[PDB]
């Protein structure tokens, strides 16, 4: 069946556009990440890292 979205349908019956994202982990190395300055490395320093 078709929704037949009309302006009259009003705030209750309005048509929304939806997008949904799924995130999975551990099964492979990371490939895509948000903007986060990448830094260099340090050895034998007891650092907290990402």
């Amino acid at each position: 069946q078709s929704y037949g979205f009309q302006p009259t349908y009003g705030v209750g019956y309005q048509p929304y556009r939806v997008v949904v994202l799924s995130f999975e982990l551990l099964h492979a190395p990371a490939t895509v990440c948000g903007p986060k300055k990448s830094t260099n490395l340090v050895k034998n320093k007891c650092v907290n890292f990402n």
């Binding site: 551990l26 099964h27 492979a28 190395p29």
Partner: peptide, 18 residues
């Protein structure tokens, strides 16, 4: 024809090192 696959087909299930 058929044959016994003795122990073939084992593969590294994950990308982790142990």
């Amino acid at each position: 024809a058929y044959t016994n696959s003795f122990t073939r087909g084992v593969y590294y299930p994950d990308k982790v090192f142990r």
